[PDB]
Design a protein around this ligand. Structure first.
Ligand code: CLA
Ligand code: CLA
Ligand code: CLA
Ligand code: CLA
Ligand code: CLA
Ligand code: CLA
Ligand code: CLA
Ligand code: CLA
Ligand SMILES: CC1=C(/C=C/C(C)=C\C=CC(/C)=C/C=C/C=C(C)/C=C/C=C(C)/C=C/C2=C(C)CCCC2(C)C)C(C)(C)CCC1
Ligand SMILES: CCCCCCCCCCCCO[C@H]1O[C@H](CO)[C@@H](O[C@H]2O[C@H](CO)[C@@H](O)[C@H](O)[C@H]2O)[C@H](O)[C@H]1O
Ligand code: SF4
Ligand code: SF4
Lengths: 30, 73, 81, 138, 69, 161
């Protein structure tokens, strides 16, 4: 296929954040 | 005007934002905040910093893991 | 505590001494002998904010109060709004 | 409002007092007497007049509405009077209750002044560890 | 009294809060359920935040021959 | 007729602010804004959803297709969708988890009309969660979609300048 290891910066530095900024808006409510 | 943060109480129904910050910085003050007993406390620092040693090895692991396939050795 | 700052003194006389402080302090509650015989440290404090205007005037001879209340409503800071 | 227009304490405009959080929670309002048509100072920055009715201005929050005194008793009058309005009724009868003028004697009500032990040598720090059986909830 | 003009038509007046336009174009239920799944909203959003956001980022980062940083 | 309405600070009592000047309550404006969720809730939030989704939709194009990160695109997937069919998505649940500051759980259906409304105490809330859904659901199909007759529209353009 050739040259393709780019997912562990969005799933982390991008999407993991989405989760918790969403999710953890559990501090406000759930 | 609801009830939230699960340990303190004065903090818990404070309608401002202090609600937040002051939540995220009383966490580690076990000795005397609602949830506590000299029995609780101790242990509540014990399986805390067993949550320690714990995070020191997910550090060291990766230290040795961005090294072994690239990062000259 | 939830509003607990001690301004007490020993005279608790309040003439050319101290009055200032939004609502909080409906005292003159004469204890059975203390000179100008009006005493203690407060009335029902669940009403107003956190001054130390509380001393500034008329002795507390020790400390004087300030913020210490933590558990802190809003009505207990101007801003709940 | 207007179809019912019941006013007393003249003003015109102002971006000062009352806004959203005096419906959705509590209300607070001061009332008074007065002799003849006089121009006042105001909380919230502005300034207007008097004459009568109830002389019943409504006020945002109760530190705000006693300052009619911290000047509005350097301008004659025994009588000034603020209560507590809800969005429905009572308990907290604010300048109501018994006697008035913070510095007399009928009853004693609350206050106390002491804690357990008095101002004396609390070089004694915090004692027991907080534990559900020894009189430290006061 | 000519300029007493009896307010050249009173109006009524105050129009209203009453009634100075009909309403919203009849275009509606021309979406009835059309696009539902936020019109089946009955438990969702967790679905569209793995799905939508694994396909604004799965292929969105990857690429078959760079055109690099 | 008067000096400026029957001359008033607010609807009435001058102890609320608002200082009703123009830019506030001139029939010149206050009517340019009430087929929509200004004074009165027309139909439910359902439909307003997409005129809101869509209008705000075909925006955010030349913003991120003419000011794009390496700009003036020669990629057939820009001068339109490209990514930004991301903003509407990063914010089409920036909303949903604000309608969790709305719950209040019902199903009446009163977008049909009865007796000349008021919705009365219509201020404060009085729009439950099963409302704020059908809007931020109108949002997605208004955002994503409103991004393509932007894109889809060729581009003949001027300026300028
Ligand atoms: C010019 C720059 C500058 C810099 C370099 C910093 C740097 C810092 N500030 Mg800071 N700050 C600044 C200006 C700056 N500040 C200014 C001007 C103000 C106000 C005048 C502040 C007020 C401020 C406060 C109150 C604090 C800091 C803190 C900090 C530190 C926390 C770092 C961190 O990683 O948190 C990371 C931040 C976040 C994770 C929050 C951002 C959330 C965003 C991305 C969400 C976007 C919402 C989105 C639309 C929703 C999509 C939905 C999705 C989530 C599902 C860091 C030292 C904090 C501190 O002391 O910590 C030790 C904190 O106390 N700052
Ligand atoms: C982005 C905004 C910012 C914000 C949050 C505010 C907020 C406010 N302004 Mg304000 N203002 C701003 C920028 C802003 N202003 C600027 C840049 C100016 C020029 C100096 C003003 C001049 C101004 C005045 C004179 C007044 C206010 C007032 C107010 C307050 C109430 C008025 C109101 O909401 O009527 C509702 C507003 C509308 C219905 C706006 C409709 C106009 C739209 C349709 C324009 C569409 C543009 C069109 C396509 C072409 C124009 C292209 C381009 C040149 C813009 C409110 C606190 C009033 C006040 O002090 O409080 C009572 C007061 O009257 N403002
Ligand atoms: C705690 C961590 C330590 C640190 C500081 C880092 C930091 C980093 N790793 Mg990493 N990694 C680690 C341990 C660590 N790693 C371990 C133990 C593994 C083997 C499972 C990996 C396997 C790994 C891969 C395949 C990648 C990274 C990558 C990265 C970089 C991007 C972040 C990311 O998506 O990671 C992904 C991390 C994981 C999949 C490990 C999950 C394990 C959990 C227990 C750790 C979560 C701890 C958290 C702080 C709490 C960043 C420099 C990415 C990169 O190369 O970009 C330059 C690449 O995606 N890591
Ligand atoms: C930890 C995170 C991180 C990561 C991984 C990224 C990643 C990215 N940023 Mg970014 N950014 C970050 C933190 C991060 N940023 C921070 C903290 C800031 C503030 C300083 C920014 C400010 C910023 C700006 C201003 C821009 C970026 C842009 C980008 C993208 C550049 C290349 C691209 O087009 O995307 C690849 C993929 C996408 C954009 C989504 C793909 C969706 C497609 C496949 C769907 C189309 C088909 C169909 C409709 C479905 C890339 C996704 C740029 C950008 O994206 O413009 C084009 C540019 O906008 N960032
Ligand atoms: C953006 C904000 C701020 C706000 C909240 C307002 C709000 C308002 N302005 Mg305004 N204004 C502003 C900044 C602002 N202005 C600035 C910076 C200027 C330049 C000095 C002006 C110059 C201006 C003028 C000349 C007028 C207004 C008018 C108005 C009112 C009517 C808007 C309208 O007619 O929609 C129309 C909306 C459209 C979308 C029409 C389409 C326009 C193009 C695309 C065709 C409204 C209350 C009008 C007014 O006060 O009453 C007569 C009018 O006289 N404004
Ligand atoms: C980038 C943005 C900026 C710009 C240029 C616009 C532009 C517009 N918005 Mg808008 N809007 C914005 C930020 C912006 N908005 C934000 C931050 C919010 C939430 C705080 C809104 C919530 C909103 C609503 C509810 C509406 C608009 C509407 C509109 C349309 C004109 C009416 C208007 O705004 O009167 C100025 C006063 C115009 C396309 C109207 C529309 O039909 O589209 C959804 C509609 O009323 N906006
Ligand atoms: C050059 C490039 C690019 C392109 C192709 C477009 C194209 C378009 N933009 Mg636009 N825009 C861009 C960059 C771009 N924009 C940027 C960088 C911004 C910064 C905010 C905007 C802000 C913007 C706004 C606020 C609006 C548009 C509108 C429009 C559309 C309506 C055309 C028109 O004038 O109405 C023709 C009107 C009649 C025939 C009547 C049009 C498809 C809208 C629009 O133009 O409506 C007037 C809307 O006004 N754009
Ligand atoms: C405060 C603002 C300032 C401004 C005005 C800009 C403006 C811009 N930045 Mg930028 N940037 C800034 C601060 C700013 N930046 C800072 C502080 C950082 C570090 C924290 C960056 C890091 C950064 C990166 C990496 C990039 C940009 C890029 C850009 C361009 C694309 C914006 C875009 O398409 O979004 C979409 C815009 C809208 C949807 C606008 C709509 C509403 C408006 C009209 C209001 C635009 C020139 C991109 C570029 O390539 O520059 C040419 C590039 O990706 N910026
Ligand atoms: C109206 C409208 C809209 C919407 C809006 C909205 C709805 C928004 C929202 C927004 C949101 C909704 C946001 C959020 C954010 C978040 C955050 C900001 C979070 C976070 C965080 C963090 C960072 C955390 C921290 C912490 C905590 C708190 C816990 C403990 C400690 C710690 C540190 C962990 C728009 C504009 C679209 C347009 C249309 C109209
Ligand atoms: C995709 C198929 C759409 C065709 C409609 C059939 C199912 C609609 C999904 C809701 C499930 C309950 O089925 C329902 O459908 C009808 C709408 O057509 C309903 O009719 C109504 O139901 C709601 C109940 O508060 C109301 O807000 C609306 O007036 C209307 O949608 C009947 O109450 C019932 O039969
Ligand atoms: S010390 Fe202060 S308020 Fe206390 S008793 Fe005297 S004046 Fe009264
Ligand atoms: S010192 Fe305290 S109690 Fe006294 S007035 Fe000030 S705030 Fe109120």
């Amino acid at each position: 296929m050739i040259n393709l290891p780019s997912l562990f910066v969005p799933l982390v530095g991008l999407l993991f954040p989405a989760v918790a900024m969403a999710s953890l808006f559990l501090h406000v409510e759930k | 005007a609801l009830r939230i943060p699960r340990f303190s109480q004065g903090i818990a129904q404070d309608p401002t934002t202090r609600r937040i910050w002051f939540g995220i910085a009383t966490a580690h003050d076990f000795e005397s905040h609602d949830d506590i007993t000299e029995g609780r406390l101790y242990q509540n620092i014990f399986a805390s910093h067993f949550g320690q040693l714990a995070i020191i090895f997910l550090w060291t692991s990766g230290n040795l893991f961005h090294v072994a396939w690239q990062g000259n050795f | 505590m939830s509003h607990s700052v001690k301004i007490y003194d020993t005279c608790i006389g309040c003439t050319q001494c101290v009055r200032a402080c939004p609502t909080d302090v409906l005292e003159m509650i004469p204890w059975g002998g203390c000179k100008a015989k009006q005493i203690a440290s407060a009335p029902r404090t669940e009403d107003c904010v956190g001054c130390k205007r509380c001393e500034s005037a008329c002795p507390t001879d020790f400390l004087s109060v300030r913020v210490y209340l933590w558990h802190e409503t809003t009505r207990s800071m101007g801003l709940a709004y | 409002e207007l179809d019912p227009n019941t006013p007393s304490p003249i003003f015109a405009g102002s971006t000062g007092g009352l806004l959203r959080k005096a419906q959705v929670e509590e209300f607070y309002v001061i009332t008074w007497e007065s002799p003849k048509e006089q121009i006042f100072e105001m909380p919230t920055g502005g300034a207007a007049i008097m004459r009568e009715g109830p002389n019943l201005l409504k006020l945002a929050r109760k530190e705000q509405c006693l300052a009619l005194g911290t000047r509005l008793r350097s301008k004659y009058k025994i009588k000034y009077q603020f209560y507590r309005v809800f969005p429905s009724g009572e308990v907290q009868y604010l300048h109501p209750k018994d006697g008035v003028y913070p510095e007399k004697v009928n009853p004693g009500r609350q206050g106390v002044g002491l804690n357990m032990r008095s101002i004396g040598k609390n070089v004694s720090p915090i004692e027991v560890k907080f534990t559900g059986k020894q009189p430290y909830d006061l | 009294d000519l300029e007493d003009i009896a307010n050249t038509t009173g109006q009524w007046d105050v129009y209203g809060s009453d009634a100075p336009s009909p309403y919203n174009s009849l275009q509606s239920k021309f979406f009835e359920t059309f696009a539902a799944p936020f019109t089946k909203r009955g438990l969702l959003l967790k679905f569209l935040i793995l799905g939508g956001g694994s396909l604004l980022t799965y292929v969105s980062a990857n690429a078959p021959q760079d055109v690099l940083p | 007729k008067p000096t400026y309405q029957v001359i008033q600070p607010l609807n009435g009592d001058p102890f609320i602010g608002g200082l009703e000047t123009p830019v506030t309550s001139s029939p010149l404006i206050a009517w340019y804004l009430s087929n929509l969720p200004a004074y009165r809730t027309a139909v439910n939030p359902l439909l307003r959803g997409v005129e809101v989704g869509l209008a705000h939709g075909f925006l955010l194009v030349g913003p991120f297709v003419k000011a794009g990160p390496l700009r003036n695109t020669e990629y057939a997937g820009a001068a339109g969708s490209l990514a930004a069919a991301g903003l509407v998505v990063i914010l089409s649940m920036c909303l949903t988890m604000y309608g969790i500051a709305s719950f209040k759980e019902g199903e009446p259906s009163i977008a049909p009309a009865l007796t000349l409304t008021g919705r009365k105490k219509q201020p404060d809330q009085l729009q439950s969660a099963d409302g704020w859904a059908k809007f931020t659901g109108g949002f997605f199909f208004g955002g994503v979609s409103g991004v393509t007759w932007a894109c889809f529209l060729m581009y003949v353009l001027d300026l300028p300048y």
